[PDB]
Every structure is written in C-alpha cells, then in structure tokens.
Amino acid sequence: HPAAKVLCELADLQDKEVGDGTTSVVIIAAELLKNADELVKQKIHPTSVISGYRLACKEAVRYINEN
Amino acid sequence: PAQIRFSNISAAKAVADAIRTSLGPKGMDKMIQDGKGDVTITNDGATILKQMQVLHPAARMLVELSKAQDIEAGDGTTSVVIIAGSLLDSCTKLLQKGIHPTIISESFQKALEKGIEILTDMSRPVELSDRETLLNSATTSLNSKVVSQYSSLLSPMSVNAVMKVIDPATATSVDLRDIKIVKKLGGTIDDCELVEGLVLTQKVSNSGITRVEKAKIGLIQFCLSAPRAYILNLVKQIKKTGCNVLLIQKSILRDALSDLALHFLNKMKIMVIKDIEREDIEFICKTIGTKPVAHIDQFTADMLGSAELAEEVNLNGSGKLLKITGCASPGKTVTIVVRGSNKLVIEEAERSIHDALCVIRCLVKKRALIAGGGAPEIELALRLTEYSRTLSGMESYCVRAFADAMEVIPSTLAENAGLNPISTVTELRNRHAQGEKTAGINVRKGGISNILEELVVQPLLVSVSALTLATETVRSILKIDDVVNTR
Amino acid sequence: HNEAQVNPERKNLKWIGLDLSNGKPRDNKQAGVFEPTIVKVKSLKFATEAAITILRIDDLIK
Ligand SMILES: Nc1ncnc2c1ncn2[C@@H]1O[C@H](COP(=O)(O)OP(=O)(O)O)[C@@H](O)[C@H]1O
Ligand SMILES: Nc1ncnc2c1ncn2[C@@H]1O[C@H](COP(=O)(O)OP(=O)(O)O)[C@@H](O)[C@H]1O
Numbered sequence: 147h148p149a150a151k152v153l154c155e156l157a158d159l160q161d162k163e164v165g166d167g168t169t170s171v172v173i174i175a176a177e178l179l180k181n182a183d184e185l186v187k188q189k190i191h192p193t194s195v196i197s198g199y200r201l202a203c204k205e206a207v208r209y210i211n212e213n
Numbered sequence: 214p215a216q217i218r219f220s221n222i223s224a225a226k227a228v229a230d231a232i233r234t235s236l237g238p239k240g241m242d243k244m245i246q247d248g249k250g251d252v253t254i255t256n257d258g259a260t261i262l263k264q265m266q267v268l269h270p271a272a273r274m275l276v277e278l279s280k281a282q283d284i285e286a287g288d289g290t291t292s293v294v295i296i297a298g299s300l301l302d303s304c305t306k307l308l309q310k311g312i313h314p315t316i317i318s319e320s321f322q323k324a325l326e327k328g329i330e331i332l333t334d335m336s337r338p339v340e341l342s343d344r345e346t347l348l349n350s351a352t353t354s355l356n357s358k359v360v361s362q363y364s365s366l367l368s369p370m371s372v373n374a375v376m377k378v379i380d381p382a383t384a385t386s387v388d389l390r391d392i393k394i395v396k397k398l399g400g401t402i403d404d405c406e407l408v409e410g411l412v413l414t415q416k417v418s419n420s421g422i423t424r425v426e427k428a429k430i431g432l433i434q435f436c437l438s439a440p441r442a443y444i445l446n447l448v449k450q451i452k453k454t455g456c457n458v459l460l461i462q463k464s465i466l467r468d469a470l471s472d473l474a475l476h477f478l479n480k481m482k483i484m485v486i487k488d489i490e491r492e493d494i495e496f497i498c499k500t501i502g503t504k505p506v507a508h509i510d511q512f513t514a515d516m517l518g519s520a521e522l523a524e525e526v527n528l529n530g531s532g533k534l535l536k537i538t539g540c541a542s543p544g545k546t547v548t549i550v551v552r553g554s555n556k557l558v559i560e561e562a563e564r565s566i567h568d569a570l571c572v573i574r575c576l577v578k579k580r581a582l583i584a585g586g587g588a589p590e591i592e593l594a595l596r597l598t599e600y601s602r603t604l605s606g607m608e609s610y611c612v613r614a615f616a617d618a619m620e621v622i623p624s625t626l627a628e629n630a631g632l633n634p635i636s637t638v639t640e641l642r643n644r645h646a647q648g649e650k651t652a653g654i655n656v657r658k659g660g661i662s663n664i665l666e667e668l669v670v671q672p673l674l675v676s677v678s679a680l681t682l683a684t685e686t687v688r689s690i691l692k693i694d695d696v697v698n699t700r
Numbered sequence: 701h702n703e704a705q706v707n708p709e710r711k712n713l714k715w716i717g718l719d720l721s722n723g724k725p726r727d728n729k730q731a732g733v734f735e736p737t738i739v740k741v742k743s744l745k746f747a748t749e750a751a752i753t754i755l756r757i758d759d760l761i762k
Binding site: 171202 | 714736737738739740741742743744745746747748749750751752753754755756757758
C-alpha cells in the first residue's frame with residue numbers, strides 16, 4: 147500500500163538517523179492515525195488535527211527537555 | 214443539444230472537483246493511482262490536472278484553462294478551474310430554468326467587463342517603481358518553504374536583473390528576456406552571480422588558447438560526416454574568417470569532430486562546444502546576431518559574431534563557464550546561475566525563481582495590486598450582485614448567478630483552514646460590505662481579520678487573467694451544441 | 701505520574717518504568733533502564749511527521 151510505503155520509508159530513514167525506535171515510531175504513528183481518523187469522523191477538519199498534533203509534539207519535546 | 218450540454222457540464226464539474234480541495238497554502242494533497250504504478254504525491258493543482266486522464270472535451274478545455282493561466286501569469290492555476298466549475302454548476306440551474314445559452318453567455322460577458330472594471334478601479338495600485346513592494350510580495354511568495362532562507366539571495370538578484378534592463382515590451386513591461394539564463398551542477402547556492410550577455414555552460418577541453426578580445430563567433434552546424442569533400446572545407450573557412458569560438462551542433466552526425474578534424478582545429482585551438490538544447494539555439498543566435506546556418510558555403514564574412522571577452526575560467530572554483538559580453542542583442546531569459554551540490558537546492562531554487570519572475574513581470578505588466586485571501590472574490594460577489602440588482606432585463610438573474618458562483622474561492626479557502634465555511638464566508642461578506650476592501654481570511658493564524666496583519670498581497674493581473682479566461686471558456690462551453698465523431 | 705504533578709513535593713516520582721520481570725511498576729532510574737534523549741525526541745518528531753503526511757493524503761474518491 148502507498149501509505150504503507152510512506153510509513154516504512156519514514157521508519158527506514160529514522161533508522162538511518164539514529165537506529166533504535168523504528169517499531170516504536172511505526173506503532174505511535176499508527177495510533178495517531180487511528181485516533182485522528184476517529185476525530186475526523188466527528189466532523190473535525192484534518193487541518194485542525196494536524197496543527198494540534200504539531201503543537202502537541204512541540205510541547206512534548208519541551209516537556210522532555212525539562213524532565 | 215441539451216443532452217450533450219449536460220454531459221459537458223457534468224464532465225467539467227467532475228474534473229474541477231477533483232482538485233477543489235487543493236486550493237490554499239493549507240491545500241490538501243492528492244494520490245490518484247490512475248496509470249501503471251504512479252505514486253502521485255503532491256498538492257499542486259496544475260500537475261494533478263495535467264497528469265489526470267482526459268477523455269471528455271470539457272475536461273480538455275479546463276486543462277487548457279489551467280495551462281493558459283499558468284503561461285499568462287503562473288498563479289491561480291487551481292483558482293480558474295474552481296471558478297469555471299462553480300460557474301458551470303450555477304448556470305446548470307439557469308439551463309434547467311429555460312434560458313437559452315446565448316443569453317447566459319452575453320450576461321457572463323457583461324459580468325466579466327463589470328468585474329474587471331470594479332476590480333481595478335478601487336484596487337490598491339503601485340505608482341513609483343517601488344522595488345520594496347516587489348520584494349515584499351516576493352517574500353510573501355518566496356518564504357515559508359525550503360527557499361525561505363534563500364529569499365535574500367534569490368529575490369534581490371532577480372530585482373537587479375529587472376532594473377538592469379527595463380524592457381520596453383508589452384507596454385514597457387519587463388518580459389521574459391532580461392539576461393540569458395545559465396546553470397551548472399555543483400557548487401553552493403551562495404555561488405549565484407549575475408551575468409551580462411551570452412554565457413556557455415557546456416564542457417570545453419582546449420589545452421591551447423581560447424581567449425581573444427576580438428572573439429569572432431560563428432555557427433557551423435555542419436559537422437564531420439562519414440562518406441574530404443565536405444570535411445576540411447570548414448577548417449579553411451574558419452581560418453580565413455579567424456573565428457575563435459564556434460559551438461558545434463551534431464544535427465548532421467554524431468562524429469562532429471574526429472581526431473584529424475580536432476587536430477586541424479587544434480592549430481588555432483578553436484573552442485569546441487557540444488550538446489546545445491534546440492530551444493536555446495535561436496536564443497543564442499539572436500544573442501550573437503548570427504544566423505542559424507547549417508551550410509558552410511553560406512558562411513561568409515557577414516557571419517562573424519560580435520564579442521568582447523570569452524574565457525573558459527573555472528568560476529566558483531570548479532565551475533567552467535564561458536561568459537560573453539557586448540553582443541548584438543543578448544538577454545533571452547532572466548539569469549539565475551543555479552549552483553548547488555544538493556538536488557533540492559537546484560530544482561526548488563529554479564521553481565521559486567520562476568514563480569518570482571512570473572510575479573515580478575505580473576506586477577510590471579500592470580501596476581495595480583490587490584489583497585488576496587478571498588478578498589477580491591467576495592468583493593466581486595457583492596459588487597456584481599449590486600449591479601445585477603441595478604441591471605435590468607432577464608439577464609440580471611444570470612449575472613446574479615455569476616456573482617454567487619464567484620463565492621467558492623473564499624469558502625474553499627476557509628474550509629481548508631478548518632473554519633466553518635458558510636459562517637466565515639458570510640461573516641467576511643458582511644464585514645466587507647460594512648467595512649473595507651482588504652477584508653480576507655487569516656488561514657495560517659486561526660481566524661479572520663483584515664489584511665494589514667496578513668499582507669499576503671498578489672498582483673491584479675493574476676486575478677484579472679483567471680477571471681477573463683474562466684469566463685471565456687464557460688462562454689465557449691455554453692455555446693457548444695453538439696460534438697460529432699467520424700471525421 | 702499523576703502524583704508527579706498534583707503533588708508538588710513528590711517531584712522525584714517521575715521515572716516509574718515497567719519492570720518486565722515481575723510485571724509491576726518500578727522506579728526505573730534506580731533500576732537503570734535508560735534511553736538516549738535524542739532517540740525519543742527524534743522518534744516522536746518522525747511519528748508526528750509520518751502521521752501528518754498520511755493524514756494529509758485524504759481527499760480522494762475511489
Ligand atoms: N529492561 C527493559 N525494561 C523495559 N523496557 C525495555 C527494557 N529494555 C528495552 N526496553 C524497551 O525497548 C524499547 C525500544 O526497543 P525497540 O524500539 O523495540 O528496538 P528496535 O527499534 O531496534 O526494534 C523501548 O520502548 C524500551 O521501553
Ligand atoms: N498565506 C496566505 N494567507 C491567505 N491566503 C493565501 C495565502 N497564500 C495563498 N493564499 C491564497 O490562496 C490562493 C492560492 O492560489 P493557488 O491556486 O493555490 O496557486 P497555485 O495553483 O499556483 O498553487 C491565492 O489566490 C491566495 O489568494
């Protein structure tokens with residue numbers, strides 16, 4: 147599947163970047179996709195979901211860097 | 214008749230809808246697996262349309278709209294298609310209401326002229342050259358991408374190329390012919406430089422001399438061929454004329470310069486240049502002023518070119534280029550020396566440069582400007598509705614339908630921003646009626662407000678051309694009554 | 701980890717890992733299971749990017 151192609155490509159480039167984490171990144175991405183699909187089923191436009199995800203990641207890296 | 218008009222309307226609306234959601238900076242990207250294993254991944258409307266299969270005539274006309282809008286201004290390629298689809302959907306109601314298509318077409322023409330004049334008279338024009346506002350528009354177009362950090366390296370060079378030659382073409386408008394472009398692989402993006410005249414990027418390997426101030430230039434497309442009758446004559450002609458730089462064209466045979474011919478051409482160490490793209494051949498010819506003659510006999514004393522300097526210097530360390538200045542009529546296509554080791558810093562740099570040159574020429578063809586973000590479309594949807602109320606006759610309803618169909622662009626722009634489209638577009642309409650012209654949407658800041666915070670700004674000509682072409686094509690489609698096969 | 705926020709004095713209750721041996725919660729900094737910060741941060745970044753890219757590719761009909 148082309149979506150599977152993209153997901154595997156991102157996993158592979160992450161592996162080439164740092165190594166460990168391909169399975170974790172794939173699992174997390176799939177969970178985010180499932181939850182975002184459930185959200186958009188409730189008449190929330192995906193662009194708001196994408197902006198929210200970006201904000202959440204930006205805040206999560208900050209939280210990690212302080213704890 | 215109507216049985217084929219309905220088919221054309223449906224086909225055109227379907228092919229417009231397939232790119233409906235790709236409009237805007239927040240445009241959603243597409244993936245159509247129509248082909249033989251094509252991984253379609255992009256959000257550009259023009260490439261989706263041109264890669265989409267075309268079977269109905271109406272789809273072909275809409276793709277032609279996209280291409281014409283692209284060549285004319287280079288922006289709003291999806292905008293014209295969406296507008297045409299909206300117009301066709303709107304006039305479907307008129308057609309089923311019993312209005313003959315000629316009335317609809319005439320009313321659309323009146324709406325076009327009224328919209329053009331309302332859009333330009335009360336717009337915000339630029340009076341002085343004002344390169345600052347051109348730079349600002351470029352930044353609004355050249356930033357927020359990979360080339361965002363390279364805006365201060367690319368836009369000022371293009372602006373300098375513009376100011377170097379204010380070409381008096383199409384009402385003293387700077388056309389596509391400022392100073393001929395060149396590009397070479399390798400180097401870095403910081404290696405960009407502006408040239409003056411003809412520049413050669415082809416590989417040259419001469420161990421002798423190729424640098425003479427009186428650089429006579431010839432074009433002998435007739436090369437060596439496998440049978441002495443027409444082999445060594447060109448060498449004698451070159452020696453008599455004294456040309457030092459003569460590019461070689463392989464339009465006759467692959468063996469352009471054999472070992473014996475090269476050694477005979479090594480006695481004066483003439484410059485050897487191969488693999489010239491055909492589209493640039495006539496540009497080079499008019500740059501030098503010589504004629505593209507493939508006959509050695511026609512080559513005479515009048516065939517000698519004009520040049521001042523010609524050096525095979527390794528520019529930027531390892532970039533071998535031949536700069537020529539002081540020619541007859543150089544300036545074929547705005548120069549941007551695309552140098553870069555990375556692959557993206559070449560293709561994206563060239564695409565951004567093309568967009569910048571289109572928008573700069575767009576603003577110099579006509580010096581008026583409007584604020585984007587759906588402001589012109591709501592302005593049209595209001596003023597044309599007012600006109601149709603003032604306009605008499607039965608074409609008034611057609612004009613009103615035209616104005617109403619012009620509301621799709623702000624609606625889809627806001628929908629791609631996640632806002633409730635209906636509520637925000639009608640709020641924008643109210644704010645525009647009771648307020649000012651510049652009211653638009655703030656797509657990437659989460660809200661709706663004036664343009665002064667936003668200042669997206671676009672030239673008037675993109676919207677003008679998109680509107681005009683969309684109206685002309687909907688006119689043509691409506692006047693269609695039948696299509697016949699079996700020529 | 702709820703008490704790591706509501707309670708301002710239980711600050712040093714944040715690295716309660718998963719003890720896979722006995723299957724019970726366990727202080728993990730003391731235990732010694734460790735992960736480079738760059739790995740977690742960049743994996744989160746790539747998970748978000750992949751989710752965003754797949755979620756953008758939606759407006760199709762087939
Ligand atoms: N001793 C341990 N106790 C609990 N979890 C562990 C331990 N060692 C490793 N892990 C888990 O392994 C995961 C990372 O491994 P993994 O991503 O599967 O490797 P790879 O990316 O090579 O497949 C982390 O989420 C971490 O929680
Ligand atoms: N940052 C922005 N804020 C508000 N509106 C924008 C912004 N960028 C672009 N727009 C609007 O969205 C439209 C996008 O044009 P579009 O048809 O996508 O061009 P292309 O087809 O070349 O991508 C423009 O008409 C412009 O008015």
